[PDB]
């Protein structure tokens, strides 16, 4: 089958701006059967160009396409706020259809730093055998941050999950929520429990800890 | 206007069987080729299947054929998807979408059903809180249940700014596992009231949990 390679996987760009994707296909795409779609998140995708160039029915002006062959390219002339989106190639042409990984295109803005707050296990989980910590990075940009557990001094690996909002449309921030999953018999051989957090906004890593068993 | 509404989906066992279905309207539905597509958990999308709009024709990509079965009842307005022998790979968003009739490409979709193949049984959460210690941080953690999705909401919808609830976590045990916190101020910790409204409508699991400062 046919493979689209999109680029960049990520643009942080600011409204009023002009936006460049591209999309590369393995082998030349059919008769420019190539199209654009735009996708917002927990919903469906959007026409926004058929046959490499043409605009769908009611996609505005600043959405154009080019390209044939192997190199395709999206351009958005001047970003509105609604445009901040994930955008897909597609090639029909030869069959099966297939989709590039897609572009995600996201709004840039000033470096914000996380608020940084840690939250200890509730007595009501430790009665089932397991404790989780929390660690939470609240309204930062840009969306890349480092988080470090650590267990008395003793770094922690293999034992922690993280997942990130989508980018606030209020302020154009990212959140992230870190836990650290231990047995309550590990939980109870330890007293401070520490949340380390690296991020572009701050000059030096910021720590928030509790000591278990401490009001 | 055109609407394509989707239904059928669910947690299936491997081995098992799904149909979905499609309900077409604003449209002459029998005049147009129709698609399903799968867009597995945080991946890219992929064809499925496709029908003629008389249903003369079918179309399957390798990775589903003979297990997967198109078809329409022009007469109902509606599109099918029956799922046999169910893989823990088929686990995706599945999207009825429908044909240009004229250029050939993908010109409408509809919003998508999360469709979960797994042996484990559906599971409510047990929901912990995650107690506050200028700007406080307080929230609820919804932790082990299956499958997707779950609600939360916060002091009954009104209380909406600060709130951040976080994408869920597949944990190794085959669980989900989310957090949602909210940002306060430290001075309201003492008078106001704070409960999370949490639903997961799978196991029919309905969750009122107030979160207090812990001495
Ligand atoms: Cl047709």
């Known amino acids: 089958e046919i493979v689209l390679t999109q680029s960049p996987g990520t643009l942080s760009l600011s409204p009023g701006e002009r936006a460049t994707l591209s999309c590369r296909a393995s082998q030349s795409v059919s008769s420019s059967y190539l199209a654009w779609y735009q996708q917002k998140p927990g919903q469906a995708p959007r026409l926004l160009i058929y046959?490499?160039?043409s605009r769908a029915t009611g996609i505005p002006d600043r959405f154009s396409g080019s390209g044939s062959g192997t190199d395709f390219t999206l351009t958005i002339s001047r970003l509105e706020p609604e445009d901040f989106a994930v955008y897909y190639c597609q090639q029909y042409g030869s069959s099966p259809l297939t989709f590039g990984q897609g572009t995600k295109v996201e709004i840039k803005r000033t470096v914000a730093a996380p608020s940084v707050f840690i939250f200890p296990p509730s007595d009501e989980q430790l009665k089932s055998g397991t404790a989780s910590v929390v660690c939470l990075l609240n309204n930062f940009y840009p969306r890349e941050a480092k988080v470090q557990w650590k267990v008395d001094n003793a770094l922690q690996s293999g034992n922690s999950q993280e997942s990130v909002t989508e980018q606030d449309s209020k302020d154009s921030t990212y959140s992230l929520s870190s836990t650290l999953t231990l047995s309550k018999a590990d939980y109870e051989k330890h007293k401070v429990y520490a949340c380390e957090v690296t991020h572009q906004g701050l000059s030096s890593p910021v720590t928030k800890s509790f000591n278990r068993g401490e009001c | 206007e055109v609407q394509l509404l989707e239904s059928g989906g669910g947690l299936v066992q491997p081995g098992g069987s799904l149909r979905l279905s499609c309900a077409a309207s604003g449209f002459t539905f029998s005049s147009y080729a129709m698609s399903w597509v799968r867009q597995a958990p945080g991946k890219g999308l992929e064809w499925v299947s496709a029908?003629?709009?008389?249903?003369?024709?079918?179309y399957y990509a390798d990775s589903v054929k003979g297990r997967f079965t198109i078809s329409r009842d022009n007469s109902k307005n509606t599109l099918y998807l029956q799922m046999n022998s169910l893989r823990a790979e088929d686990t995706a968003v599945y999207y009825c979408?429908?044909?240009?009739?004229?250029?050939?490409?993908?010109?409408?979709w509809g919003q998508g059903t999360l469709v979960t193949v797994s042996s484990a049984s559906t599971k409510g959460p047990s929901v912990f809180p995650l107690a506050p210690s200028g700007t406080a941080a307080l929230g609820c953690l919804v932790k082990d249940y299956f499958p997707e999705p779950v609600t939360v909401s916060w002091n009954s919808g009104a209380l909406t700014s600060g709130v951040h609830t976080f994408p869920a976590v597949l944990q190794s045990s085959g669980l989900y596992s989310l957090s949602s916190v909210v940002t306060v101020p430290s001075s309201s910790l003492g008078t106001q009231t704070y409960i999370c409204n949490v639903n997961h409508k799978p196991s029919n699991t309905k969750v009122d949990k107030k979160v207090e400062p812990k001495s």
């Open positions: 029908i003629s709009g008389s249903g003369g024709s079918t």
């Open positions: 979408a429908k044909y240009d009739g004229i250029y050939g490409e993908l010109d409408f």
């Open positions: 046959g490499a160039s």
